[PDB]
Amino acid sequence: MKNDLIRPNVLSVKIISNVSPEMAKKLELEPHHKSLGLITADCDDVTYTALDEATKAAEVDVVYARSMYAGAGNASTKLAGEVIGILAGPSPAEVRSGLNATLDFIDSGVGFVSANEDDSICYYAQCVSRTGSYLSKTAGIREGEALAYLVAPPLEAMYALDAALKAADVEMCEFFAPPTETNFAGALLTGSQSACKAACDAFAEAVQSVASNPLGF
Amino acid sequence: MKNDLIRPNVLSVKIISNVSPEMAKKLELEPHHKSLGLITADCDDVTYTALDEATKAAEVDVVYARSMYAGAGNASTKLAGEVIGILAGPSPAEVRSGLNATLDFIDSGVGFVSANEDDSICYYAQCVSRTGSYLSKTAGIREGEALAYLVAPPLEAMYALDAALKAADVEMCEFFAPPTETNFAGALLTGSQSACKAACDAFAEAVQSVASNPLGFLE
Amino acid sequence: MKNDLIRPNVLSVKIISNVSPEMAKKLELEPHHKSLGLITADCDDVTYTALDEATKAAEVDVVYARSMYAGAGNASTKLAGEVIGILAGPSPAEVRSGLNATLDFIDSGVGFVSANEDDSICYYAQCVSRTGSYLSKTAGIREGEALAYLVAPPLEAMYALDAALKAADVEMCEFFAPPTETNFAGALLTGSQSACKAACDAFAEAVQSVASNPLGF
Numbered sequence: 004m005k006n007d008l009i010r011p012n013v014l015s016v017k018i019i020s021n022v023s024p025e026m027a028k029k030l031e032l033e034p035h036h037k038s039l040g041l042i043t044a045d046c047d048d049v050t051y052t053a054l055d056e057a058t059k060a061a062e063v064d065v066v067y068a069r070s071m072y073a074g075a076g077n078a079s080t081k082l083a084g085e086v087i088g089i090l091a092g093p094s095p096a097e098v099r100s101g102l103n104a105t106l107d108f109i110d111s112g113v114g115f116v117s118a119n120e121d122d123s124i125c126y127y128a129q130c131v132s133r134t135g136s137y138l139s140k141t142a143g144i145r146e147g148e149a150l151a152y153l154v155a156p157p158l159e160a161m162y163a164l165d166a167a168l169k170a171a172d173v174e175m176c177e178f179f180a181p182p183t184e185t186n187f188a189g190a191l192l193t194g195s196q197s198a199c200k201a202a203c204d205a206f207a208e209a210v211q212s213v214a215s216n217p218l219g220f
Numbered sequence: 221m222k223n224d225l226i227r228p229n230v231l232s233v234k235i236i237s238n239v240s241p242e243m244a245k246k247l248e249l250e251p252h253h254k255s256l257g258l259i260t261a262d263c264d265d266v267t268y269t270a271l272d273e274a275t276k277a278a279e280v281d282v283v284y285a286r287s288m289y290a291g292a293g294n295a296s297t298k299l300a301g302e303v304i305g306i307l308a309g310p311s312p313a314e315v316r317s318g319l320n321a322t323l324d325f326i327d328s329g330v331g332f333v334s335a336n337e338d339d340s341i342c343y344y345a346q347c348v349s350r351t352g353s354y355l356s357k358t359a360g361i362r363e364g365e366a367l368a369y370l371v372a373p374p375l376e377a378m379y380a381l382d383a384a385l386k387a388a389d390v391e392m393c394e395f396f397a398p399p400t401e402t403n404f405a406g407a408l409l410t411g412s413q414s415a416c417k418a419a420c421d422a423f424a425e426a427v428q429s430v431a432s433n434p435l436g437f438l439e
Numbered sequence: 440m441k442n443d444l445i446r447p448n449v450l451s452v453k454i455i456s457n458v459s460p461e462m463a464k465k466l467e468l469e470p471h472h473k474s475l476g477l478i479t480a481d482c483d484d485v486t487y488t489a490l491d492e493a494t495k496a497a498e499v500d501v502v503y504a505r506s507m508y509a510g511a512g513n514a515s516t517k518l519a520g521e522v523i524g525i526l527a528g529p530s531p532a533e534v535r536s537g538l539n540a541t542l543d544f545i546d547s548g549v550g551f552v553s554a555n556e557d558d559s560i561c562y563y564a565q566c567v568s569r570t571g572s573y574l575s576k577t578a579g580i581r582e583g584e585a586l587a588y589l590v591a592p593p594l595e596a597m598y599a600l601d602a603a604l605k606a607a608d609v610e611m612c613e614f615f616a617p618p619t620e621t622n623f624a625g626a627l628l629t630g631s632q633s634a635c636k637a638a639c640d641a642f643a644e645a646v647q648s649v650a651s652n653p654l655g656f
């Protein structure tokens with residue numbers, strides 16, 4: 004139903020101790036990256052937010068983060084979901100600490116939200132109050148600054164991004180042009196925490212507006 | 221069955237009367253582009269043709285147009301379909317005129333056509349007599365020149381494209397290498413108006429002949 | 440069920456005589472290749488192996504080979520499957536021989552292997568004892584050298600590639616970074632035949648270990 008949280012689910016997690024040099028090379032790891040933490044889940048942008056959160060209190064870097072074509076509902080295998088993320092760290096223990104923070108965040112109540120009665124339209128309107136090292140890098144902002152992380156299906160997202168930019172004192176940092184691999188779209192916008200919150204609220208309202216009257220015209 | 225029209229459907233439409241400067245920049249709007257029209261539908265190449273037509277009937281430009289991975293039948297949300305298009309214009313009235321022209325074209329009888337009994341093979345063989353500003357730029361030809369707009373699933377398309385090029389005095393302007401995002405293939409071909417139509421007819425017949433005998437010499 | 444072969448299927452085959460100059464140019468055909476053989480199937484990496492085998496038994500080159508977004512299970516038309524391949528040869532006779540050799544290999548008992556009861560996790564761990572001209576070119580090795588052709592879903596593949604590289608005297612030749620169009624991943628590894636075999640065995644065991652305990656870390 005409208006405003007229901009879509010629960011995100013972790014599907015697989017593994018640690019690699021002593022990654023092989025060939026893989027370190029293809030993954031373009033830094034010399035001090037000895038261990039990898041691998042994770043897949045059925046919701047990509049939640050997982051991206053969670054990996055970024057893990058970087059704040061552990062010595063891990065997000066070295067790989069990709070979404071699957073056509074999303075988790077079209078996955079052909081059980082563990083592919085719609086995202087793969089890889090953390091790299093100095094040891095299996097520090098990687099485990101990052102993975103633990105990732106899982107905790109994924110289960111913290113964050114998630115996409117339904118915009119209508121049968122949950123056939125959903126969006127992500129997440130106020131990242133202080134970025135870690137991953138989203139700060141991708142958005143081009145300093146670690147510790149705020150983002151609105153806004154995602155919705157393509158038309159909803161273009162419409163609602165415009166609404167969010169008009170409603171709030173925020174800047175466009177990164178545009179997820181439609182389609183992403185999952186056939187969504189959105190952006191990372193930056194500003195103060197209150198401005199990012201105002202952008203999240205406006206984005207959510209606008210997606211719901213489209214959902215209620217898609218063909219108004 | 222064979223030759224049945226696959227009806228295209230519009231799923232959502234919206235106008236933005238005056239776009240935020242931030243979005244105007246990311247969408248690379250022209251300075252006089254104040255307003256946007258957004259549309260999604262369940263058939264990408266028909267929508268691209270329709271948007272091109274809108275640039276002829278109203279003072280609008282196609283500023284964004286992309287297809288969705290694995291097509292409308294695999295859409296995970298209600299309005300994603302398999303295409304998003306964005307028209308930009310000087311005011312909401314011109315954008316509204318462009319969107320109306322787009323919707324009119326989509327319901328005009330143009331569409332993909334079935335090639336077999338259960339409609340599991342389909343193709344597009346559309347002769348654009350006079351391109352607007354969108355398909356001309358996509359093909360690299362002058363606005364107003366003609367196009368054969370040919371799309372089919374990968375093997376059918378490669379076979380039928382080769383057949384069309386032999387059948388008519390046309391040149392390949394843009395190759396849609398398999399897979400497109402929707403797992404189709406095809407091309408935009410140009411030439412005189414009669415040659416583009418001759419190519420369309422040849423493309424259609426060639427797709428049909430594969431569809432009628434998918435394993436070729438293996439029976 | 441676990442260790443079942445997943446049967447691959449050919450969906451469409453067609454021969455062209457005297458390809459158009461325009462299509463010959465776009466496919467970068469050799470001047471004397473006047474004939475094309477088109478094939479589609481529902482399993483991409485098996486078909487890529489089969490096309491490479493065809494180049495050993497007939498005077499054909501692989502000139503096109505691509506996978507479809509989201510795999511055969513999500514195909515929207517009857518003949519798209521998840522792969523298109525194109526063989527080129529001097530005449531329909533050579534192309535016909537190559538297509539027959541491709542079909543015979545696809546029907547030879549090669550295939551992805553199931554890792555669980557409902558065949559919702561599967562992997563490919565194929566030792567190519569003697570490459571043809573297609574996979575040797577893709578891997579950057581001399582024609583006739585051996586390959587381990589290793590494919591699995593994204594997390595399984597990264598984990599199991601690391602296991603394969605550690606288990607045998609092999610080098611990574613080509614990395615299929617997740618996602619491929621079909622939302623798989625893997626690599627081509629080379630070495631001696633026994634080392635490629637050792638890599639395949641290690642890859643298969645590692646994929647199975649993830650399938651048996653996906654969330655244990």
Ligand SMILES: [Cl-]
Pocket residue numbers: 435436437438452453454
């Ligand atoms: Cl044939």
Ligand code: NA
Pocket residue numbers: 076077293294512513
């Ligand atoms: Na599907």
